[PDB]
Amino acid sequence: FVCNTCPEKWINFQRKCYYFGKGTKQWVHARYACDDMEGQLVSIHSPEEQDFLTKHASHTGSWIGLRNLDLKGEFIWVDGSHVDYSNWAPGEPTSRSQGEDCVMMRGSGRWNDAFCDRKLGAWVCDRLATCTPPA
């Protein structure tokens, strides 16, 4: 059993599928775009997953599945997972909004807090990879 099979217009990495979305859309507005295309906004859990994303990343920044609910201070991924791997930029995560503050990836791959209503050029979708029959 291996997971290399990817859907149309999606790139494989380990056991995940990544869609490098393009188009002027705000955070929650790109979050729902992932859903319709049978996935979710990218959950970054390893330095390897990050460097792959840094490789295919956009020059003008990309949206990622990280959102704040300060009422805790901390951040949560869209898949319900907490923050393991952290690629914060200098000063980050200092909420550039109090509470609800979404996270975006730069060209450098470095995360920074951004206003929930920022109209960004790109976003990164992700789903698990479709499995392989036995050898």
UniProtKB/Swiss-Prot annotation:
Disulfide bonds join 3-131, 6-17, 34-125, 102-116. Ca(2+) binds at residues 92, 94, 112-113. Residues 5-127 form the C-type lectin domain. This is Low affinity immunoglobulin epsilon Fc receptor soluble form. It comes from Homo sapiens (Human). The lineage of its organism: Eukaryota, Metazoa, Chordata, Craniata, Vertebrata. The gene is FCER2. The chain holds residues 158 to 292 of 321 of the full protein.
